[model samples]
Target: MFKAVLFDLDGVITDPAEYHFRAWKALAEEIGINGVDRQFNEQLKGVSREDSLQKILDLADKKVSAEEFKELAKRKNDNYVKMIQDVSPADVYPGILQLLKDLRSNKIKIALASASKNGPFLLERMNLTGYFDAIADPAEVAASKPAPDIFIAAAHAVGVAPSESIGLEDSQAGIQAIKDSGALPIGVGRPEDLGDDIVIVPDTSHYTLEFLKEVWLQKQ
Candidate 1:
């Protein structure tokens, strides 16, 4: 059995990526760029705020001064914050709460390893703060995923070694980070996109405590 489980906030814990995508889509529409689709938005997954905005600009083949880019990034984040202001416990994905509870009962450490600087705020807003033993934010790391700094920091914070932990992620960068940290990577989407090395599950809804244990054992 794994000693710990590290979770990514946006697509893994909640669907706040939809809010982030809408904010970016709205911004792109205002800028008269028509390329911000769901697939395009996936490219921003596991990236930091600045990187996400830069990726959006790259999508449009647009350029802005550093100051201008900073301004636009702030605007996008402000919009996302406003949109998620009403997020509550109900916003957490189905089966996630029970999964957390099960992990806790099993003496497994839980940590948040997110590139989002807003990870703590979102967890608090969603009433999911108490579930994690440690929360590692992008601001706390020198580099983000796929650098492994965030997950490494989180595993350290929770007193778990990478080899004894499993990370749950929904993005390529996130899984890369988990692998770089020497942890078992559990992919939470289609196998093709997340790769074949990790265990791929449709979503948290399809996983239970027993399923998680089974995966951990198989990985071992």
Candidate 2:
């Protein structure tokens, strides 16, 4: 049985993709990188702030001083933070809040392993902090997703072994992180994007407690 469930923040819990894209798009324009769209946004998912900047730089074939890069990153974060200031629990996806409630009721420890520095604040702003036993913020991890460090850390944080945990994610990088961490991977997006090992769902709205129970049963 899965003793704990690890969640990724953005697309898994809520639709912060637009907020992030708006921030990134503005930054891309500022940096003279054209055509910042969904395709480009996919590259940014599960990546670090520095890596995100590097990606844009790669597109533009540009270089910057460390200070300039830092400023741009900060500016992007400032925009994202501003956008999420009004978030509330009502903003959480259809099945997600209910699933969190059910998980807690069943004594399944819940943890968040997100690459965003804004994660904790988003939880607070959305009134969802009470749902989690632990929050593995970007600051807490030495590296970001596609590395197992954060998810493994999250498993330990919730007093569960990696083998006894299931990780829910909406990005390839996050799914890979779960696999590398030795946890079951539940991918929230398209199956092809997540690869063969992950259990795929269209979105959080489909991931009910009953659905999870069925999955757990299937594992038996």
Candidate 3:
């Protein structure tokens, strides 16, 4: 139903998954918390760094002011960015390239809905800036994903109605946001983690443009 394709940054776009994972885990360990587990990793998959920081602090049972959270979150991001700067296009899975090529060849509009303020940098670094028609990063939104603000803003930018858009995500917060925006969500990993509203992707390497073509043909 969507005339546009919305891609998520970080895991969904570039392969910054492990970069974020290591940064957060290291920070947590230094702060005396175990943040490298499955649940904590899920927090980084699709949400903003700020929201994930709160979850980390909450899980650690540590109370901190908003300003304190910002400082800590920025510190973690600073480290994460340094690592991501070394990313290569080889970091992208095999099949996703075909998917991007397919979407472009088919004349479909592509957009990015990312929580990272460093989104532009990531895209440019990965040579993916030309892949999309528009982008909506959380930096411009009043609220982050799971709140629908960023996705809604993306829909508007692409000039597509919510029901006519499809979003790719890798986290619960992102799934909720896509649902809130009235869009179909094709998740990149662990379908069970997100439940029925999502279509599970075994991994990025398994995704293909034809898969997306099939998804388009079977819209709800």
Candidate 4:
């Protein structure tokens, strides 16, 4: 039986990608980098703030000093935080609260494996802080998604072996991290993006304890 479930915050929970994109776009414009589109924004998912800024810099063929990079990242985050100020419990995706309740009732551990530094803030805003037994700090992890560090840390935080947990992610990087960490990966997006080999649900609304258990059993 699976002892725990790990979740990625942004896409899997409430989809704050739009706010993130808008913030990034605002920052790009201020830096005179044109065309910060959604397709490019998708590449930013599950990446650290510095890495995401580096990608934006690469796209514009722009270079900045370390101090300037830090300032830019802070500006982007400030904008994102401002944009999400109104986030409430209603912002949570369909079936998520129910799934959390179900998992709790079943005595399953729930932990967050998101790369966002605002994981705790977002959870509080969405009234989801109580659902998670552990919220792995991205800052404490040695590496970000696709490196298995964050997922490993999350499983460790919950005192659950990675092999006995299931990780739910919306990004290809997060899914790869879960797989590398020895957990079963459940993709929450397109097959083309998350890969077709793993089990996937199109959205959070499809997630249920029964469905997840079946997927876990099939994998074993």
lDDT string, candidate 4, 86-158, tens digits: 7899889888999999999999999998877788998999999888999898888887768999988989999
A best-first ranking of the candidates according to their lDDT comes to 4, 1, 2, 3
Candidate lDDT scores, in order, read 0.84, 0.83, 0.77, 0.89
> On TM-score, who's better, 2 or 3?
2
TM-score of 4: 0.84
Best by lDDT: 4
Model 2: per-residue Cα lDDT over 1-220, one tens digit each:
7899988888888887777888898888776788689988976765677888788888868889999989889999888888787778877887988899999999999999887777888898888988889987577688777899999998998898988988888888888889899988878877777788657898788888788777866866
List the pairs of residues colliding in candidate 3: 2-164
Residue 208 shift from truth in candidate 1, angstroms: 2.1
Query: Cα RMSDs of all predictions?
Result: 2.8, 2.9, 3.8, 2.7
Displacement of residue 105 (Cα, Å) in model 3 is: 1.0
Determine which window of 10 residues in candidate 4 has minimal summed lDDT. Answer: 42-51
**Candidate 1 residue lDDT tens string, 69-133:** 99998888788878887788989998899999998898899999887767888899888888889
Tens-digit per-residue lDDT, 1-220, candidate 3: 3588787876676667678887888788878876468665965655667878878888768998878788898889778877888876776665667778788888888888887777777777777767778988577788776887888888889888777788888778888888898878888777567787457787877567667667867764
Q: Which stretches of model 3 miss by more than 4 angstroms?
A: 21-73
| Candidate 1: residue 136 lDDT (0-100) | 78
Write out the backbone clash pairs for model 2: none
TM-score of model number 2: 0.83
